[PDB]
């Protein structure tokens with residue numbers, strides 16, 4: 001019956017915003033390597049939503065080249081007049097973004113070739129801007145160890161988040177107006193299982209839509225009815 | 236009138252034989268980087284002349300590839316039936332030289348590409364043998380720094396010889412039967428100028444052929460007559 005919150009600031013969100021603003025204002029490269037289902041994509045989306053001079057793209061294996069990634073960057077910077085070449089595209093990206101004190105955000109940096117990430121680091125080094133990587137722990141694990149070693153000298157900042165926190169899901173429950181202590185422990189048990197923010201928000205929206213359709217309050221019984229579903233331990 | 240010595244053991248020769256036998260019996264890679272005119276080529280030739288299970292090739296820019304270098308190696312190992320391919324040539328070189336406890340000697344390793352020296356180090360690592368490099372100081376200076384870094388872990392031994400020694404030219408003068416103290420100082424002055432063994436042996440053979448043609452002994456005057464030639468300080 002109250003509003004379902006689309007987002008809440010957490011301890012992990014306040015950490016990743018600190019590292020984000022650090023990589024931007026420092027104008028240096030930071031890696032966010034950690035297991036997904038923790039919210040780094042939506043946190044970076046929230047940062048780009050709240051703050052200007054911030055740019056965030058995604059990288060697919062269908063867009064794993066240098067040219068496709070720079071085309072994504074040209075679409076993100078607001079330039080539909082991107083040349084199909086690699087050279088003058090790169091120099092136009094260098095022209096547009098110089099002096100902006102901007103921030104480039106890279107999601108799924110584990111799908112990168114060495115030439116692609118090398119062109120991105122030489123780009124940001126020739127632009128005096130900040131670069132932020134996302135993905136699993138393989139993003140850092142592809143570097144330990146000699147081809148990204150100068151990049152390992154440029155990579156100074158990383159905040160690695162494997163699993164969530166107690167105050168993390170506590171602030172989430174505060175956003176969703178949850179005060180049951182057994183409910184708190186059950187949400188922590190949800191946070192124990194992987195895909196934590198995903199499975200958590202699934203269970204929360206199931207319980208919320210159930211409590212609105214039945215006209216009631218989300219209780220621990222609606223949490224068991226939601227979390228008992230989704231077939232997580234089914235092989 | 237006595238015999239002109241083709242070779243003498245020196246302190247530098249005893250050092251480079253120690254490093255040579257070390258790289259061979261250790262079955263690991265050693266670098267000899269230093270300015271030429273010091274005798275490393277003739278010392279390695281002397282080592283191969285005195286000792287069995289020892290192989291020494293040269294590398295030209297006309298033979299700077301992997302295939303040409305392995306063809307040189309196949310000629311050096313006594314196999315005229317070398318295939319023109321790169322694969323079965325390399326495996327035949329691996330077959331012939333395994334269990335031999337041999338020594339490969341490389342002259343002018345400064346002309347090497349990374350693929351060539353990488354194939355040589357993977358060869359010797361797949362053969363359990365010793366590899367010895369020669370050349371100027373650029374041989375080590377091409378590594379400081381990430382592509383030969385694992386090779387920098389395999390390169391443990393190096394003896395760098397820039398200039399000669401006092402006992403060096405003293406033993407040379409003892410081979411050439413020289414007992415003048417001013418003659419000793421003048422030979423040291425020859426050793427000060429670069430191309431030391433080359434210019435030294437040039438001056439020695441000029442003085443020796445002069446003393447045989449005039450029927451006399453090599454004196455300090457024949458040393459001035461030889462060393463005053465060769466036009467070293469002429470631009």
Ligand SMILES: Nc1ncnc2c1ncn2[C@@H]1O[C@H](COP(=O)(O)OP(=O)(O)O)[C@@H](O)[C@H]1O
Nearest residue numbers: 007008009036037038039040041042197198201
């Ligand atoms: N503050 C928040 N409150 C609730 N859910 C969040 C919050 N931030 C992120 N999420 C959740 O994170 C999920 C996506 O992030 P995630 O899959 O962890 O990204 P990545 O796959 O890059 O690690 C979304 O389903 C979203 O519900």
Ligand SMILES: Nc1ncnc2c1ncn2[C@@H]1O[C@H](COP(=O)(O)OP(=O)(O)O)[C@@H](O)[C@H]1O
Nearest residue numbers: 242243244271272273274275276277432433436
């Ligand atoms: N023991 C020795 N006595 C006299 N001369 C020597 C001796 N060893 C080497 N040399 C001289 O070294 C010269 C060639 O070696 P060098 O040019 O220094 O090889 P590199 O060019 O590989 O450094 C020859 O001219 C030879 O006269």
